[PDB]
Design a protein around this ligand. Structure first.
Ligand code: MG
Ligand code: MG
Ligand code: MG
Ligand code: MG
Ligand code: MG
Ligand code: MG
Ligand code: MG
Ligand code: MG
Ligand code: MG
Ligand code: MG
Ligand code: MG
Ligand code: MG
Ligand code: MG
Ligand code: MG
Ligand code: MG
Ligand code: MG
Ligand code: MG
Ligand code: MG
Ligand code: MG
Ligand code: MG
Ligand code: MG
Ligand code: MG
Ligand code: MG
Ligand code: MG
Ligand code: MG
Ligand code: MG
Ligand code: MG
Ligand code: MG
Ligand code: MG
Ligand code: MG
Ligand code: MG
Ligand code: MG
Ligand code: MG
Ligand code: MG
Ligand code: MG
Ligand code: MG
Ligand code: MG
Ligand code: MG
Ligand code: MG
Ligand code: MG
Ligand code: MG
Ligand code: MG
Ligand code: MG
Ligand code: MG
Ligand code: MG
Ligand code: MG
Ligand code: MG
Ligand code: MG
Ligand code: MG
Ligand code: MG
Ligand code: MG
Ligand code: MG
Ligand code: MG
Ligand code: MG
Ligand code: MG
Ligand code: MG
Ligand code: MG
Ligand code: MG
Ligand code: MG
Ligand code: MG
Ligand code: MG
Ligand code: MG
Ligand code: MG
Ligand code: MG
Ligand code: MG
Ligand code: MG
Ligand code: MG
Ligand code: MG
Ligand code: MG
Ligand code: MG
Lengths: 87, 67
RNA sequence: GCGGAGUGAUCUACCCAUGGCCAGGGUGAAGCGCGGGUAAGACCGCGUGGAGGCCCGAACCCACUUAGGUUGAAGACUGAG
RNA sequence: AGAAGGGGGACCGGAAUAUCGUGAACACCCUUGCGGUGGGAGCGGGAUCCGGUCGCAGAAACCAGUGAGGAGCGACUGUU
RNA sequence: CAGCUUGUUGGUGGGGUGACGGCCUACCAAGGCGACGACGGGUAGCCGGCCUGAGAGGGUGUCCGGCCACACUGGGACUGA
RNA sequence: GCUCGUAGGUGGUUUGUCGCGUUGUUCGUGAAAUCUCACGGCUUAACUGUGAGCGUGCGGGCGAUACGGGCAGACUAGAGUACUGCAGGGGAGACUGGAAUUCCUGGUGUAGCGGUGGAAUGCGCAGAUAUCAGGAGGAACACCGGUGGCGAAGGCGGGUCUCUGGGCAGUAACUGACGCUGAGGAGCGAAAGCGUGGGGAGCGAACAGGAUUAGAUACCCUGGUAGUCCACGCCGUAAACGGUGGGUACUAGGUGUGGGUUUCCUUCCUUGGGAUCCGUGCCGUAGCUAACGCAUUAAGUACCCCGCCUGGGGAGUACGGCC
RNA sequence: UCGAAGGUGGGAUCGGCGAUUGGGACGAAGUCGUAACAAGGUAGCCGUACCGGAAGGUGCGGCUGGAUC
């Protein structure tokens, strides 16, 4: 899902300067929201493999972005980790 | 390691036949009289007498501390 | 042996109601936590826990083997297992 | 599976005066009670290491699994 | 051949060596090695050299030279620079 | 078989620093014989002596940052995110519709029906086939429908609703190399088959009868069980094929189709032509190929990554190991 | 104390033989069939299941490495 205003809420919550959408922080926040929604949907319709593949792709993309932000700025990585969740 | 530290060292040596340049990582044990070193913590090492059974290096100085 | 009418479940077989009993050791199921693992898992390791027509073994319930008894202590028992 | 197969086991002394662990007296505060904390006396328990001593034998008497391998039948606990 | 190690890895205090060192010892930590192949199995003396190949390479270690290991098999000490 | 992704390998433009890789010089070392040039001596050669090369390397100092690399920065083109539109049998769940077959009940009704190249087994006469009306039940969704669309692959259309995935187009709104491949590993994965419960109209292995034939354990006919269906698991195999791994850059054209956008010819109504992006077919230039053929959707020209082969059987079999 | 050799025990690994038995290769001029190469007389292959003296047959799904309008 992630309607327009639903995206905007997380964007202003996790953004950098009032318009950021493509930074690792905002991208990881949106991907985490999508992953949580998809997993909650997948608790129902356990045979939706065509959407489970998309969920796996989102998980991989979020993992790669997390790795990039961790390598680029340890402090920002730790802040995002505490703000969102890891392990 | 109770006054010892383990330091990863890497080097590159040309393949004898194919000629490609490859990178290999090693592992040495370095003596730390005052054990102050964490994950990362780049260190320059100079090799000494056999201080222990498996120690042939000592701490010189700490450069480019862990981020 | 056959028939008629009666007597017996104080022995024994099964059942119904209401009570009682089972020394002492051992093993360690589910469930519940913690950590590891991951995106989540599945799973894994530590604890806790104390299951079972579970194990060893007295009381108790039996009766597999053997010896004795065999005008017996006893019309079915005793000793050792 | 207690598979099998091995090792140790007695006494005296020291460690050892909180050695350790059990409970917690005298004596320590407060909303004064059948109250709380510290405290460690006296009394019990278990284990280990080191040294020594005795005997033929240290599980000491009584008590207290024999074990392994191959087949047949019945899955098993039970019943006769 | 996918998990290997407990004097094993390190530290401390002694002992030992011509000499550093778990080399040995008493105590403390939980560490050390492994997919760049440990651990395990098969095979083998290594090198300068020798042969073949235009070369790269493939085979080989015999004369000779350098070293290493051994002296019936297995183990140990002493004399002595 | 496809996809994801661990390690690993590899990587856009630009600035500064180091000088590790790179490279130059110098010094030490690289034993001798033996290998080679040039000579000298055994009457010559073999043999031997001398001078120089060899000793591909290593350590040390002193020069360079052209490329790779470390560090510190910067940019938007790669890549990702943002906003607005677009198409779709992408997927899951729930409810529901019609045709048809079969079966049941009743009416009409009598002697055949079915089947083949020909028949017979079979069904009916105890009322069959056929016809009408009603009901029960499972499976599959004609027309649309195609050369089309979607999906990583396998695969995907009766209708409606709910949830959800991906892609394309446009602006360049945002980050700023965050990219490519991917050993192992993980997930998905036609049909057949397996476990548990349900369901079973039709078809239909096995099986039975008939028929053909010398024989017919088949092809043909009559039947008929599992299965095909649903729910949750397992299995992980196909000519799972484009017999062509993934990503990028470049290399004439001509002609269809699909989704967009864009000015113009803007009414020449034409929804045609022109420009661009993403695909999907065919024909065709160069080039490649043994040939067939490929040819912008390459099997052409190059780069990076992974997988695979070294004659045919034995054999994708034995043993061992994992499931 | 350590310590060669030796003894006792359960295992680990590599070979040899083995009654009997399975499949394979080659032989001759044997017996039983014609499954494939033509539309090979029922098109051929691929995975699976079942069956039968044997090659093979049948069902399910896929390919043309065949044809048809
Ligand atoms: Mg020291
Ligand atoms: Mg009578
Ligand atoms: Mg009576
Ligand atoms: Mg008991
Ligand atoms: Mg438990
Ligand atoms: Mg019992
Ligand atoms: Mg009885
Ligand atoms: Mg008797
Ligand atoms: Mg008598
Ligand atoms: Mg008796
Ligand atoms: Mg008795
Ligand atoms: Mg025992
Ligand atoms: Mg046994
Ligand atoms: Mg004595
Ligand atoms: Mg006992
Ligand atoms: Mg038998
Ligand atoms: Mg029995
Ligand atoms: Mg049986
Ligand atoms: Mg020690
Ligand atoms: Mg020491
Ligand atoms: Mg040898
Ligand atoms: Mg050659
Ligand atoms: Mg020897
Ligand atoms: Mg001799
Ligand atoms: Mg000897
Ligand atoms: Mg002398
Ligand atoms: Mg001496
Ligand atoms: Mg493929
Ligand atoms: Mg294949
Ligand atoms: Mg295959
Ligand atoms: Mg990686
Ligand atoms: Mg990389
Ligand atoms: Mg670059
Ligand atoms: Mg790199
Ligand atoms: Mg001469
Ligand atoms: Mg020389
Ligand atoms: Mg130099
Ligand atoms: Mg872009
Ligand atoms: Mg369903
Ligand atoms: Mg019916
Ligand atoms: Mg009728
Ligand atoms: Mg009718
Ligand atoms: Mg910017
Ligand atoms: Mg990839
Ligand atoms: Mg892989
Ligand atoms: Mg199926
Ligand atoms: Mg089934
Ligand atoms: Mg069933
Ligand atoms: Mg028949
Ligand atoms: Mg038939
Ligand atoms: Mg039929
Ligand atoms: Mg079956
Ligand atoms: Mg599966
Ligand atoms: Mg297919
Ligand atoms: Mg290729
Ligand atoms: Mg390609
Ligand atoms: Mg390509
Ligand atoms: Mg086109
Ligand atoms: Mg063509
Ligand atoms: Mg080719
Ligand atoms: Mg196999
Ligand atoms: Mg096997
Ligand atoms: Mg034999
Ligand atoms: Mg034939
Ligand atoms: Mg055939
Ligand atoms: Mg025929
Ligand atoms: Mg045929
Ligand atoms: Mg058949
Ligand atoms: Mg078949
Ligand atoms: Mg077919």
């Amino acid at each position: 899902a992630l309607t327009a205003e639903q995206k905007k809420e997380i964007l202003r919550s996790y953004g950098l300067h009032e318009t950021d959408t493509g930074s690792p922080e905002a991208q990881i926040a949106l991907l985490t929201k999508r992953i949580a929604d998809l997993t909650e949907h997948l608790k129902v319709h356990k045979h939706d493999h065509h959407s489970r593949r998309g969920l796996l792709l989102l998980v991989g993309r979020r993992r790669r972005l997390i790795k990039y932000i961790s390598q680029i700025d340890v402090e920002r990585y730790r802040s995002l980790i505490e703000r969102l969740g890891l392990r | 390691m109770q006054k010892t530290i383990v330091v990863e060292l890497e080097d590159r040596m040309r393949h004898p036949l194919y000629g490609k340049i490859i990178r290999t990582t090693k592992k040495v044990k370095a003596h730390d009289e005052d054990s102050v070193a964490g994950i990362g913590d780049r260190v320059s090492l100079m090799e000494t007498r056999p201080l222990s059974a498996t120690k042939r290096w000592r701490l010189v100085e700490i450069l480019e501390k862990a981020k």
